[PDB]
Amino acid sequence: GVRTSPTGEKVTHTGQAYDDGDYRRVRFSDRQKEVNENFAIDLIAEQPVSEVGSRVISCDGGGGALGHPRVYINLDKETKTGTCGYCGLQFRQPHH
Amino acid sequence: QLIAVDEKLDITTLTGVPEEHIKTRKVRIFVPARNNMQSGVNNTKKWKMEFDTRERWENPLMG
Amino acid sequence: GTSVKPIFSRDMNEAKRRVRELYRAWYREVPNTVHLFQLDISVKQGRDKVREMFMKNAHVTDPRVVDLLVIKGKMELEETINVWKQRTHIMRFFHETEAPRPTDFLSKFYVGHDP
Amino acid sequence: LHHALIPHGKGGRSSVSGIVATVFGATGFLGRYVVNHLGRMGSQVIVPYRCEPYDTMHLRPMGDLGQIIFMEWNGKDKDSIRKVVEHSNVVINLVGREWETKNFDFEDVFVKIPHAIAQVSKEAGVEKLIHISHLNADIKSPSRYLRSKAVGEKEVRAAFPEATIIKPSDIFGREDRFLNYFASMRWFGGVPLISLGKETVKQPVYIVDVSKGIINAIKDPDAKGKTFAFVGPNRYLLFDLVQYIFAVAYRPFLPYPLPHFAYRWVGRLFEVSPFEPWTTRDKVERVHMSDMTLPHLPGLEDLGIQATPLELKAIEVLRRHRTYRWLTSEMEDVKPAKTVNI
Amino acid sequence: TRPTIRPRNDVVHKQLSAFGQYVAEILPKYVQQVQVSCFNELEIFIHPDGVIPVLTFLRDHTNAQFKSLADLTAVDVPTRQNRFEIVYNLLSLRFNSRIRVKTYTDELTPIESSVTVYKAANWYEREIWDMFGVFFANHPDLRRILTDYGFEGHPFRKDFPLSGYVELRYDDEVKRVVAEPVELAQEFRKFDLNSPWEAFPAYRQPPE
Amino acid sequence: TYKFVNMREPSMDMKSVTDRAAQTLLWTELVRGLGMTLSYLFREPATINYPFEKGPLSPRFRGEHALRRYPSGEERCIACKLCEAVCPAQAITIEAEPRADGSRRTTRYDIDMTKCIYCGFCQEACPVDAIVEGPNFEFSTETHEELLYNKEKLLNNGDKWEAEIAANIQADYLYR
Amino acid sequence: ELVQVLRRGLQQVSGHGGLRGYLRVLFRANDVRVGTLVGEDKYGNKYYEDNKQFFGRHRWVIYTTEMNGRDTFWDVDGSMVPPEWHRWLHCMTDDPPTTKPPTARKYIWTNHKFNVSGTPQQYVPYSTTRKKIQEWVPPSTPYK
Amino acid sequence: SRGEYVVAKLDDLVNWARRSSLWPMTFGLACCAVEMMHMAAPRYDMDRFGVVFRASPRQSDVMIVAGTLTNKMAPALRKVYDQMPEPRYVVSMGSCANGGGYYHYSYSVVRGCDRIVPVDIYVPGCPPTAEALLYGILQLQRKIKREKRLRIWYRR
C-alpha cells in the first residue's frame, strides 16, 4: 500500500518519509529509495475471520513446528474477534 | 629495604588516560537500586562506580 | 616505613638524577631522529616537544611513579633509536590534524554540553 | 535551522557539523584539501565530478559513511548544476584550468560556468556561495586568465550579491604548480627568467591556509558579501624565490635572462601539447607579473588564520626533487631567502 | 546422577591434597594457602617475595619436577588493595601432573622476573607488563609486545575502556596515518544481563 | 605406544653400497619425483568452470540474511529482540512500537553486514523463524554503505529468496 | 582409442548447432561439453547435466544473453540464477524445479534481479524510524 | 566522429588488457587469507582468469585486504599501497576488513580498511567463501571494463 509523499517520495510501511526541507534526500539523487511493496498490515487485513465451534481455539501459525509457539485464544466476547498475538489471524464463534 | 613513601597515592600519570577524562569527569559510587519490576535482590549486593552521562547524537546515516 | 619497596630509586634525588640522565639521552637523540625519519620539523621544535613531554609530569612527588615514568621514557627512546617507530608514531606527539578545542566558557557553551 | 542540520558531537569524523557543501572542482589541487577539511568536521560533502571515477578515489577516505556523495555533472548543462546544489546550504566554486582546452576556453571556465553555478545556487535556495578568484585579477591585464577572472568575479557578484569572494595568490603545496613548476625546469640546463627575475615580486600562500580560510568563511556570519585577499606573510623577488627553491632542492642554480618575445615564443611552442602543457604563454605572463597589494581588503588574519611562511613548508614540497645524496637534509640548513618586506 | 553430571575422581583429589601439604610443609616461609578445586586442580598461594624459591623448588625437586611452564598471566581485581594477581601454571611430565602458583602485586610494586627459572617466561612477562602495567625486576628485555608503538595505557586493566581512547585514520593533508580521540558512529550497547535471583546457594556470602 | 620415524641405518653390503652410489651418481630419486609430477600432468584437473559451474553447498549453509513472512503475507518478526541480544558482533539494531492495528511489529530492523560474522546465532534464537541466513553468497557491493541493511532491504531479500529459503528449511528443520 | 576421442570431439562440435554454435559456446562459457538439457529458465538460462563428470562439473548453466535490461552476452555473473535453479545448481538438492517446483506465495518476486551494485538501482541505506522530538511551533499572529 | 571512435576502441583495448591481467599483491592478514589460498587452489584456479600473485608491490595491480587491520599494521598497509604503481585497485575481503567485524569495538582494530585506503569492491563474509571472492574479483573486472579514460580525456 505504498502512498506517495507530497514531495514525490515513496512512503515506507513504517511511515518515514523525508520532509521537503530535509537535506538527507540527496542520498537518493541519481539513485533510488528502497521500499518494500508488500505491506504486512494490509496483507493480514485480507484474511477471512475463521468461525469455530468452541469457546477456546488454538493457533500455531500453520506448518506445525515451522510456525510460532502454540497459543490459546479466548472467544467469549461477542463484539470483537480473537486475534493471534504472533500470526495476526482472527477467530470468532458463530453469532447472529 | 623499604623507602617509606609518605605521599598520597596517585597513579594518574601512568594510566595513559587523557587529561580531559581525569579532571572533568565525575564518578558516582553507589549500590544499584532494585529493579522494581522484580522482587529479586541479588543485584543490590555490590558497589558500582560509573561516570557521568555525556552527549549521544543520531547518526546521519542509519540514524 | 609504609612497607613499600623501591624499583630503582630510594628518594627523590636518585629519581631526579635518572630523570636528568634520561633527559640528556632524549635531547641528544633528537637530531638523529629528525635526520633518520626525515621530519619536516626543526631540531629546536623537537627539543621543545621533549621539554614539554618532560614538564607534563613535573608535579609528581612519588619516587616509584618517577621510576616508572623514566622506565617508560627509556622504552620510548629505544623504539625511536632502533627505528621501530614510524614517522607516524613520532609525529603523533604534535597533533597536527586536531582542531584546537577552546578553553573559555563562551566557546564551550556555544559548541555543546561538555565542560 | 532545520533540526536535521543542528551540530552534534565533538567536531570529529562521526560528528555533525550542520554543513552541506557542494564543492565544484573538488578533484583539483585545492579541492582535495577543502574536502578533507570539510569531512574532518563531519560535514555532508557533495562532490560533483566529470572525470573518470578512478580519479576520485583519493577523496573517499576523507569522510565517514555516507558523508561524501559523488555525482556526475556537465559544466554546460544547468540541470546538472541544479541536481548537485539542490539540497546544499553552501556551494564552493573551485573550477578552473590553467590552459585553454579545445572544448573550454578561459571564459568558459572562469565566466560562463561560475555565472551558471551562482545563478542556479541563488534560484535553488542555497544560502552561502564561496567563489575563488585571483589576487591579480583585473580586466586590463595582459593575461587572458586574469581578465576572465575579473569578468567572472563581477558577474558572480551580480548573480549572487551576498557571495563571499576569495582571491588567493600563488598557492604553494605538495601538488602545486608553483614550487613544483620552478623545480621542474632544472632539466632545461638553465633557468630562463625575464629580466633575470629582478623586477617581479611574489607573495605565495600556503595551501592549508587557503583551505582553513575557506572553511572559516563558510562558518563566519559576517563574511557574507565580502571579498578576501589570501596572501602569504612575505614578499619575495622572483630571482630570490627561485634561488631559494633551487637551494632547498639542492640543485645547481644557473639562471640566465631571456627576452619577453623569445620566452613568449617558447611558451607558444609548448602550448601545442594535446595533454597538459609544460608551460603556456599565459603561464609565462602570470609568472613574470608582480603581485598586487590590496591592503583595504580583508585577509587571512581576519578569519583567524596566521599565514604559514614558505620557509617552514618548502621542504615538504621540494624534498621530492632532491637526489639521494641530499635526501636526508634537514629544514633549518638552507638559509631563508631575502625578503622584500615593505 | 550418572548421565548429565561430570563424574568425580577422589584418588586424584587425595593425591593433590597430599602433595599440597607436602609443598606447604617444605616452604613455610612463603606459602600462604593451598587449595584443591572440586575438579582436582591444586592451587598454591604464595607471598610475592617467594616467586624464585617456590618456582625453583617446583622445577628442581625430585618429588615435584615441574619442568614445563604452561602459562603465566595476570588477573585484575580493582576492589583489592593489591590490584594484580600473578598466576603460574606448571606441568609435570615425570609425574603427569599440573600445579598452579598464585601471587599478588599492585601498580607500583615490582615482581621478580622468573626468566632464570623458566626460559618461556620472558615473553609472558613482557605481555603482562604490556597489558597490565606490572613491572618485572631483572628482566633481560622488558618492553611492549602486543600493543602499537607509543600506545598509552594498559588495555587489559578493568578501568581502561573497551574501545580505547584514540583511533586511527589516514589524512591526505599530512600524507600519513594519524591518531585522533575516539568517536563512535554507533556506541557499544551495554547489556544488564545479571538476574537478581541467586543461582548457586553453595557460594552465598555472609551478609555482614 | 610410540614409534620411531628416523632411526633406521642402512646396510653395508657391497651391492647396497653400489646401489647408493648409483643413486648418488645417477639421480634416481629425482627421476622418481619427476615421474610423480608427470603422472599428475596426465590426470584430469579438479577445476570447475565458474561462474557456469558452482561448488557444492548444503541446506545448512549460512548466507545473506532475510526477513520472512507467514503464508498470509504477514511478517513473522514480533520484535522480541532475542536475535539482537544474542548477536556476538552487536550487528542488529531494532526499534518497535504497536502497529496501527495493535500488532507488535518492528519499526527499525538493521543488520550491519560489515559487523556480522555470519554465525547464524540470530536464526537459532528466533522463535518464529523470522530472521534466517539465506543461501545467497554472491552479493559483493562497490560501496561500504550498501552493506548496511535496513528493514526494507531485508524484507525484499526475504521476498526474493523465499522459494529457496523455505525449501532449505523444510529439508533441515528436523535436525533443529 | 585415439580415433574414438577424435570422433567424440567431432560429435561435440556437431551437437552444439554447427560451427557457429560451437564457437559461441567456446567463447562464452570456455567449455564445449554437451549434456542433457534439464530445463530452461524464465529469463533464458539453460541448465544441463552430465552424470559421467566428477562432482562439481556434472551440472552447469548457460546464461542468457539478455537479462532484465542489460546485454549479458559477454558480461555474465552468478547472481543471474533464480532461487529455485540456485538451489538445484549448488547441489543443495537432487530435484530440479521442473519436477519439484517451489511453493507459490503471493509475495514472492515474480521477476528475479541480479546484483544491482554500481547502477542507479543500488540500495541506499536510510533510517526507517520517524522523528523523535517535536519542536514547538510559534503562533502565526503578532503579539503586540 | 572519427577521433571519438578511435579513443573508444583504445579504451576497449586498454581496459581488456588491464582486466585480463590482474596481479594481486601477495598480501594477507588473518582468517580470510586461508580462503584466498583456497581460491588459488585447483578447484577454483584463480590463475585461469589471468590472476596470479606477485610478491613485490611494484609488480602488483590489486591489493586484497584479507583479514583484520590493526592500528599497528595500518602504516604498513598504507606504505605497501602507496608503492603500487597506478592503476591500482583495492578489494576488501570479509567483515574485519569491511567494517571491523567482530573486533569493531576493540581498542587496537581499525574499523574498516577504507579509513586507510580507498576500496573498490567490498566482499562480505566471515570469511567469504572462495566463490564469494571469485565473484568479487570478476565484479572488479567488470568495473574495470566499464571505465572510460580516453573518452573523458578526449572530451576535455
Ligand SMILES: CCCCCCCCCCCCCCCCC[C@@H](O)O[C@H](CO[C@H](O)CCCCCCCCCCCCCCC)COP(=O)(O)OCC[N+](C)(C)C
Ligand atoms: C601495434 C601495437 C599497439 C597495439 C597492439 C595490440 C596487440 C593486438 C591486440 C589484441 C587484440 C585482443 C583484444 C580483443 C580480445 C577481447 C575478447 C572479447 O571477449 O572481448 C569482449 C568485448 O570486446 C573486447 O572488449 C574488445 C577489445 C578490443 C578492442 C579492439 C582492439 C583494437 C586494437 C587496436 C590496436 C592499435 C594499436 C596501435 C597503436 C600504435 C568481452 O570479452 P570478455 O567477456 O571480457 O572476456 C571473457 C570473459 N567471459 C568469459 C565472461 C566472456
Ligand SMILES: NC(=O)C1=CN([C@@H]2O[C@H](COP(=O)(O)OP(=O)(O)OC[C@H]3O[C@@H](n4cnc5c(N)ncnc54)[C@H](OP(=O)(O)O)[C@@H]3O)[C@@H](O)[C@H]2O)C=CC1
Ligand atoms: N592553485 C593556485 O595557484 C591558484 C588557484 N586559484 C583558483 O583556484 C581554483 C582551483 O585551483 P586548482 O584546484 O589549483 O586548479 P586545478 O586545475 O588544480 O583543479 C581544477 C578543478 O577544476 C575542475 N575543472 C576544470 N575545468 C573544468 C571544466 N571545464 N568543467 C568542469 N570542471 C572543471 C577540475 O576537475 P577535472 O579534474 O575533472 O577537470 C578540477 O577539479 C581555480 O579556479 C584557480 O584559478 C586562484 C589563485 C591561484
Ligand code: SF4
Ligand atoms: S549471523 Fe551472528 S553476527 Fe550475524 S546478525 Fe546473526 S547473530 Fe549477529
Ligand code: SF4
Ligand atoms: S527476528 Fe526473530 S528473534 Fe529477532 S526480533 Fe524478530 S522475532 Fe525476535
Ligand code: SF4
Ligand atoms: S572476517 Fe572473519 S574469517 Fe576473515 S579475518 Fe576477520 S574474523 Fe577471520
Ligand SMILES: [Zn+2]
Ligand atoms: Zn497464529
